[PDB]
Ligand binder design. Structure first.
Ligand SMILES: CN(Cc1ccccc1)C(=O)Nc1cccc(S(N)(=O)=O)c1
Ligand SMILES: [Zn+2]
Length: 256
């Protein structure tokens, strides 16, 4: 599977029939139909003790990986019961500024989308968590092109060292708090991984406020490669799944 004409999202259901399931992601967030839920709690993002370790080009995106062997960087509150540990973040982005996000807002596509991936500590590790309907919490943050995001620059500047699939680099002491917008207002709904195996294990928490990144920052994302070293160059762009049917789900808003 990938994002090309012959192996992209429209083909995934052949290997992963859950692609046509009842709680697939991403979705379009219709802002007028989302309902304010006053029982939703503020999000608690506790990233002060985060320990980043490594950055990896996995052939579909790049992951910044964290030490998740202790409760060092955790997400709690909001719609969540219990404690969810940060394991990695990554992005999805476009070939052009007019596309790239997975979720859309009133059909608007952003230039990119950041996914901060967390697993429910009651399941012991990530591999067990993805087998559970409440196993993961993914915090999604839209990126628009405008001013630079200073806290993203350290990520941008290492990408030259992980150009191709399978390359990794040490990436310690990175603070993911520098990727957050000011407001933690959010929408939430039950969904899935947006990549094969498309497991229906995610509580999605999508922030209303985008972050701004510069044109030069996103252009550096677009220099990455899907291919391995010594294979024909295929730029890593348009690594996003389009919006899927909402089916029998309601999107809830934390804000009026
Ligand atoms: C493809 N693999 C490897 C993988 C292989 C087999 C089983 C489980 C996982 C992923 O882990 N993907 C992933 C993980 C978390 C979040 C998101 S996302 N984009 O929904 O935030 C995508
Ligand atoms: Zn993702």
């Amino acid at each position: 599977w990938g994002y090309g004409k012959h192996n992209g999202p429209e083909h995934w259901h052949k290997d992963f029939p859950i692609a046509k399931g009842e709680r697939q992601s991403p979705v379009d967030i219709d802002t007028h139909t989302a309902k304010y839920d006053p029982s939703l709690k503020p999000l608690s993002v506790s990233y002060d003790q985060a320990t980043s370790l490594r950055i990896l080009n996995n052939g579909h995106a790049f992951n910044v990986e964290f030490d998740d062997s202790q409760d060092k960087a955790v997400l709690k509150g909001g719609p969540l019961d219990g404690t969810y540990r940060l394991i990695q973040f990554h992005f999805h982005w476009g070939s052009l500024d007019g596309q790239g996000s997975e979720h859309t807002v009133d059909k608007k596509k952003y230039a990119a989308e950041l996914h901060l991936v967390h697993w429910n500590t009651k399941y012991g590790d990530f591999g067990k968590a993805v087998q559970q309907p409440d196993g993961l919490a993914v915090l999604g943050i839209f990126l628009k092109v405008g001013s630079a995001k200073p806290g993203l620059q350290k990520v941008v500047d290492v990408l030259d060292s992980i150009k191709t699939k399978g390359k990794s680099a040490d990436f310690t002491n990175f603070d993911p708090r520098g990727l957050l917008p000011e407001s933690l207002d959010y929408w939430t709904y039950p969904g899935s991984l947006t990549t094969p195996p498309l497991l229906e294990c995610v509580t999605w928490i999508v922030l209303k406020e985008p972050i701004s990144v510069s044109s030069e920052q996103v252009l550096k994302f677009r220099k990455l490669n899907f291919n391995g070293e010594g294979e024909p160059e295929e730029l890593m762009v348009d690594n996003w799944r389009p919006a899927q049917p909402l089916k029998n789900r309601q999107i809830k808003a934390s804000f009026k």
